[PDB]
Amino acid sequence: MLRVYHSNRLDVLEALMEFIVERERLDDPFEPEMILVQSTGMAQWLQMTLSQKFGIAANIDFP
DNA sequence: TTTTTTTTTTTTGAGCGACTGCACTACAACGTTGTAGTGCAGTCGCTCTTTTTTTTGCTGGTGGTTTT
Numbered sequence: 001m002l003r004v005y006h007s008n009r010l011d012v013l014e015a016l017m018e019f020i021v022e023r024e025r026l027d028d029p030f031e032p033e034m035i036l037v038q039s040t041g042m043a044q045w046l047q048m049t050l051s052q053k054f055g056i057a058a059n060i061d062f063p
Numbered sequence: 064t065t066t067t068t069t070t071t072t073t074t075t076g077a078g079c080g081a082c083t084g085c086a087c088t089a090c091a092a093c094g095t096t097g098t099a100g101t102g103c104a105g106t107c108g109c110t111c112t113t114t115t116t117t118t119t120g121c122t123g124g125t126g127g128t129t130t131t
Contacts, residue, residue, distance in 0.1 A: 040128090
């Protein structure tokens with residue numbers, strides 16, 4: 001199902017992504033997680049925020 | 064295939080046009096001489112702007128910097 005989350009800032013969207021990750025876990029542990037980004041810098045900032053939120057940011061692809 | 068020395072600067076404006084001095088003949092005043100007009104040459108001032116006009120792909124799209 002296609003889901004669009006309207007928000008004013010990206011911190012609430014990162015909290016929603018954290019809630020989706022902690023709610024629904026992947027069946028395969030080595031299955032990659034695709035996070036579509038605008039650029040490499042936004043991918044690095046999202047990896048920084050996911051490392052600060054989860055404690056670990058690994059096996060996450062930013063295509 | 065190897066390798067040596069070394070510390071002195073220079074030069075540069077020219078054509079256009081006038082000022083002044085000396086020679087040179089034409090002609091009228093008193094055969095000869097003084098004044099006037101022009102030619103030629105040495106010397107010298109002067110003077111040489113202003114300015115601005117543009118398209119280029121931010122990531123146009125299997126793209127993306129950096130660690131063992």
